[PDB]
């Protein structure tokens, strides 16, 4: 019996096309360019979710550093003091305190100078 | 038990291998053929049972031996098949070429020769020949060797 393509290929192409909604010109319009665009995007996404973890940590650090230097020390000194104090509050949080709770950040800074 | 229940046992019906159907299958593109060259070509190589790249082959360098025959061909001479005493175990009374054919022991168009593997049994065994040890075992067990001609 014969098994002509029939419905199947239209159906794969739409799947891809639908994922490509939003892309520029032929990239959302032509299955071929869609797919090409999509390979790139799966990789960036993968790569970039890896690096979001870095992107944020670098941010927290810049903030913590700014807050430290209001209290006359730098990030490297502050971190070492915390290490020595045994304080394990992570940077996501150090950074939130630095902005939302300055009295608390100050005490931590204190603990950090003292700890050395 | 019904038509919906009829199933071949596991492994009784394996799927075929399909090549040249996409990357996930791991047999796409080159279709497990590797790249380029004669063996990847449609039509492929020479008889790899024989041919060796142009150098004289393994086979054709070994000496021929013996009588290969001449026109008008095979010389007609009587042919003998041996059946051992042990194969005669199953019979009682008499064995003859014909019975042995039926047992699926002696092939048609061969003469019967009785041979010595096994024990003789006091039977009347009729055949075209006996080996030295067959005759011995047979006489000793009180069986009766009968030559045909």
């Amino acid at each position: 019996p014969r098994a002509k393509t029939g419905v199947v290929r239209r159906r794969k192409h739409k799947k891809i096309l639908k994922l490509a909604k939003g892309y520029w010109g032929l990239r959302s319009k032509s299955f071929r360019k869609a797919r090409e665009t999509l390979f790139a995007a799966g990789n960036y996404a993968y790569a970039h979710r890896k690096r979001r973890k870095r992107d944020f940590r670098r941010l927290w650090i810049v903030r913590i550093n700014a807050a430290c230097r209001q209290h006359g020390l730098n990030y490297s000194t502050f971190i070492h003091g915390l290490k020595k104090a045994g304080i394990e509050v992570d940077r996501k949080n150090l950074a939130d305190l630095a902005v939302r709770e300055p009295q608390v950040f100050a005490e931590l800074v204190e603990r950090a100078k003292a700890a050395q | 038990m019904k038509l919906s229940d009829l199933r071949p046992n596991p492994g009784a019906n394996k799927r075929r291998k399909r090549v040249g159907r996409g990357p996930g299958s791991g047999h796409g593109k080159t279709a497990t053929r590797g790249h380029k060259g004669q063996k990847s070509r449609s039509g492929g190589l020479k008889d790899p049972r024989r041919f060796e790249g142009g150098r004289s082959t393994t086979l054709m360098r070994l000496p021929k031996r013996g009588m290969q025959g001449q026109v008008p061909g095979e010389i007609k001479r009587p042919r003998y098949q041996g059946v051992n005493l042990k194969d005669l175990a199953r019979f009682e009374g008499e064995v003859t070429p014909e019975l042995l054919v039926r047992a699926g022991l002696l092939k048609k168009g061969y003469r019967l020769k009785i041979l010595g593997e096994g024990e003789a049994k006091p039977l009347k065994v009729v055949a075209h020949a006996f080996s030295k040890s067959a005759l011995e075992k047979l006489k000793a067990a009180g069986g009766e060797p009968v030559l045909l001609e």
Partner: protein, 202 residues
């Protein structure tokens, strides 16, 4: 070794039959596979680039035309062209081992016997070729048509009478085979039918 209801003027007696104790569903499957494959017509065909109607002239020169190279237009790469490795007339049959069929025949009957679904009958009352006649008898023998029946008998008059019923498949005893037994829910035999089947599985 199995006890099989037999319908009679005496009434529901019994009969002892040695049918296989064990059923080998794979083997039953093999017999059906064979039966259904050998009935195949094998008539799907297609044309090769050689059997297609066009000429063998190379359509345009090999080089310098700025187009792709082609030979004739019968090639499978052309719409209109031949088909690659399409179907050609084919014989689907093969010789399934006789002992397998034999063993299969037996096991199928055995399977029904083991389910109580096998019924032997002495003769058929008033059925003289009329569907209503068979229908009467059938009801009277516990066949309300809620279950499919493979009616096996050498009596032509009984076969005609039953053949139009949607729930009845009919056969001469020489025709008995495992697909038909397995296809139907209930097996009904003449003694004379049952006799040949015994002779067949011997």
């Amino acid at each position: 070794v199995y006890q099989i209801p037999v319908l009679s003027p005496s009434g529901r007696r019994e009969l002892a039959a040695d049918l296989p104790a064990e059923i080998n569903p794979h083997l039953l499957w093999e017999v059906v596979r064979w039966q259904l494959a050998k009935r195949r017509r094998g008539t799907a065909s297609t044309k090769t680039r050689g059997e297609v109607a066009y000429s063998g002239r190379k359509i345009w020169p090999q080089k310098h035309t700025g187009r792709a190279r082609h030979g004739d237009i019968g090639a499978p790469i052309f719409v209109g062209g031949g088909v690659v490795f399409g179907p050609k007339p084919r014989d689907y049959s093969y010789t399934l081992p006789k002992k397998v069929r034999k063993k299969g025949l037996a096991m199928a009957v055995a399977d029904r016997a083991r389910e109580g679904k096998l019924l032997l009958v002495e003769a058929f009352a008033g059925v003289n070729g009329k569907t209503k006649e068979f229908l009467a008898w059938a009801k009277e023998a516990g066949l309300d048509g809620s279950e499919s029946v493979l009616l096996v008998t050498g009596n032509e008059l009984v076969r005609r009478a039953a053949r139009n019923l949607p729930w009845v498949v009919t056969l001469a005893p020489e025709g008995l085979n495992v697909y038909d037994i397995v296809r139907t829910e209930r097996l009904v035999m003449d003694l004379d039918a049952w006799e040949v089947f015994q002779n067949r599985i011997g």
